[model samples]
Target: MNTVPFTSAPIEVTIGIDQYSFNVKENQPFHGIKDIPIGHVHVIHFQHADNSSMRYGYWFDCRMGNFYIQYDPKDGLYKMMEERDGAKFENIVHNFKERQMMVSYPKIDEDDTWYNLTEFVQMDKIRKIVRKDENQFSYVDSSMTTVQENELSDPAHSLNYTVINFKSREAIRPGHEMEDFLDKSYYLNTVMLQGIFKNSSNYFGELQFAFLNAMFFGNYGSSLQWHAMIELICSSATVPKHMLDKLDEILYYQIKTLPEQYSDILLNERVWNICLYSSFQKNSLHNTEKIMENKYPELL
Candidate 1:
């Protein structure tokens, strides 16, 4: 087999024969607000009116060492498996391998969107999803045809496969329509908060670019591609206070601004359970309650 090129790689394949369907139509991403308090840490699944997936508050305390966030479509949730829980990288790899969860960012089109995806499978998730060697293909009823599964599973075949690092530049301006319309200047501000622009001392530029790429093309449903970048950002380094606050404000603007943007289009989930799942993780919910305590004392 030839070495794979990542930009056109197919989404990861299942471990066995393709099977099952999700009860997704009845299930939409979560909305409104739900609260969970683990120990003294109070958190909220603060979904917006528009139903977009917001990032998690500090659920597991900014990850205790290493971690992964995999989005499982079977449940429409983002699963956070951690190294802090004593699971080694190999364990994480096996977990990802079993689930075949490899996240990637999509290529954005002029009129297209990064988050509007709804289908179970993205048509553009892979470049040439159809096989070219038609005569060279065959299917086995008992399964283990290998090639078909292999081509799809090729991404997960190795730790080094299917991931491409991209470079995002602040001076270059933005690409997608949303970014353009919003006058998104800082590459960071486009996807995240109204804070930092060019990642100062940018080291992991590739992952940063892929993280940037995710906002342009990846959506909540394309878990591996979408959430994985988030996992990368969360795990790769120490996310400073503002970084987490930045992510928190992402939801803040989402829920807070919902009524402002023509019902929050210029704002807004199935994404609710993900919020609930990460309830015990690191988040500033206490800080937030403290925040509200300050403002709403007047409400009192």
Candidate 2:
């Protein structure tokens, strides 16, 4: 058994698994959206600190829920128990020579009462993911044998043990192609905004970056990342009044330039409302409602 290398500082990581199913007809162009198959979902929160971490894994089925893992350290990385079934992390290896990582966990099912699940993930693929340089990540799952229910079991064991390839729709510039110009516009503008944010330190530059990040991620269903940044920036007392006005002006200009069809979604109420409210909260004199009225009158 090996230890997972982690920082001394605590980092909050939450992962939610959802089932995605296609709803579009055959041979139809994909609208880039999928139906959430079931409300039942599993969420795993890992609070890591130094060589040890606490895991709070749960499965929510309708209003009923079950906690699968609690904080308890045993031999071999970390051992977590759930009822009579439990799992152990055999190894969490990161090689400087190979520049890659392999994390392994095992599953146990007894008396056919619960599903036994085992998983391993390549941490290197996660770096490629955050850099937006690659689309696929590799993971190993051996879950078929754990299912107690006959109806849920696959006798052929097609899914018993396999290395799954997962890909994402997140922007990977220079190679990404979208037929819709509006979607392309969103991608390009976001990239530009992120670049400018990284290069600038002035209040206006920071505010614009924060606003754009929040708008983009909030719409994309990843608000937690940007919301945390927004809260940090907006709560700062060093925010400037001139920069706030400049931001309002920029929003007004962009609103005027947006195509009608694109404007309906791009200049959504949530976007404008968040921008205005955050500005007002930062500087009480920054008249958020007035800015909204001038820039996005329909929203007010």
Candidate 3:
């Protein structure tokens, strides 16, 4: 377990099981495909034991997953793509694939389920609606960086082995925003979970399903997950009264912590909480009360 010094000033990682090596422009800031900056993204070198291979740990979208990614300099540009190597990158495609299979060595029959990152990455409807004709997610204003935001994950990159694509940021978003994101996220999960219970006639045991719910809720942004949880209490039979009470208290505290500068985002917080709650509760009643009838139905 040899760890490199954080401020070593230069980094080169040896690659492959046979130890082919490449130098990383140490701590260089990279945005999108072609835009490299002098000081911005928190870039660092990380070596994998499989071959003593080194890659950059680019931490992007840090609010929910502490999400970090490494693009292979050896593998080159194809590293960022969803369809690279002619396969959809579902969950953890390599090692986690083996974990999903029923193996007797260590005996792990418990399944690991996850939503594909492509779901968010490929959110075309939401993308077009929010951004107008854009399919890529933008981390920064493109006028500032001419490179298209998500162009790194392109098919053309399959052959370019010259420079690696990278992304990194330690954390983003405030706590309250994270909370709001997770609420919506969980609400959607409960909807899917209840549907699975109905259609498959399969039931997830309480603890397993709770952990599953928690894990998935935390998978996306934290604020969306919070929205999902609040929605569940309003609509799903799975929500216990105590959980509802807990959610209320949580929202109550978050509302209290709003900064004066963000008064506008906070002004709608209470109503947003109530809106999701009502949508769920009314939906739970067996009688369909068109969700958004009481409030402006198009908040999302």
Candidate 4:
């Protein structure tokens, strides 16, 4: 370990229309945007140095002001909490320098038995602490482009949507004394995998309960039907290893979303790999719009 520590000077970083200040450290980055009219923020700070961070995403409503958040991993349980009371905005630079210090997804094996929804009860504690004062989750999305609006589900549009968000990355600014962490690091435009996990759970009053419903009653099983439900509830996806490690729960619940209409098709390993052939395989944007028109003719 080096005897000399990096200076602990807080610096300014801007995104979209707002700015925030926090101490900078090696490999730990913070970038975000202040979306207007809707007035909320989409920010990401990878808990790890790599692009593989699954738990490191947050959305802040503009009305919440500038409350600071820090992770508390003590007493063998973990919490995400605001460092100060809601009325005051505080800046926290608590250390996540060592990976071991993080409370993250436990070591999971793909072949492990399908798990129950019990542990996810910790999810309520998470939201409860963060919003100890009031229940809240930000809803504004970053894009206003019609392209994404017209073809929202097309995977290409998802990638392109991020491509546009990146055009305004706020990893650093002048006089802050650092290069763009984004240039040296990587991230996701939307919530990271774990963030998706948390928010999705929050949506169904603990999405795990949703899984429970789809699984035991609706017959969602390894055939994996609720993949659509959870994803649509949270954010869309391409799987990461952290996600695959929980394949048992995913598959089992998916099969029972509504007593087994969906099959293993989408959840199949090879099937997932091939679905990205391009914008051509799925119905054309033109054809897709007709279905929308047919379903909602009142809007048309």
Q: What are the candidates' C-alpha RMSDs?
A: 22.0, 23.0, 18.5, 21.8
lDDT of 1 at 186: 33
Q: Stretches of candidate 3 above 4 Å error?
A: 1-225, 235-238, 256-258, 266-300
Tens-digit lDDT string for candidate 4 (1-300): 001011221232111111122333433443211112222222223222232212223333334444233333242111223323432322121242232222222224462222333324343333332232353432112221222234434332121111112223432334432332223112221332233333333332233433432232222231232333332212223334343234334433333332223233223333222222221221222332343234323322
lDDT of 3 by residue, 1-300 (tens): 111111121233332110112334444331121111212211222353334422322212212122213454565411212222323233333333344321111212361111111111222222221232321321111011112333333332111111111111111124435543434323323333443333111221221212221222111222233343344345443455444454444433333333344434323455364644554443332211232333333442
- lDDT (Cα atoms) of all candidates against the true structure: 0.27, 0.29, 0.28, 0.28
Greater TM-score among 1 and 2 belongs to: 2
Q: Residue 252 of model 2: what lDDT?
A: 44
Error of 3 at 45 (Å): 18
The all-Cα superposition gives candidate 2 an RMSD in Å to the true structure of 23.0
For all predicted structures, in order, the TM-scores are: 0.21, 0.24, 0.24, 0.24
- What's model 2's TM-score? 0.24
Q: After superposition, how far is residue 56 of candidate 1 from its true place, in Å?
A: 29
TM-score of 3: 0.24
Error of 1 at 188 (Å): 16
Angstrom error at residue 283, model 2: 6.8
Judged by whole-model lDDT over C-alpha atoms, candidate 2 comes out at: 0.29
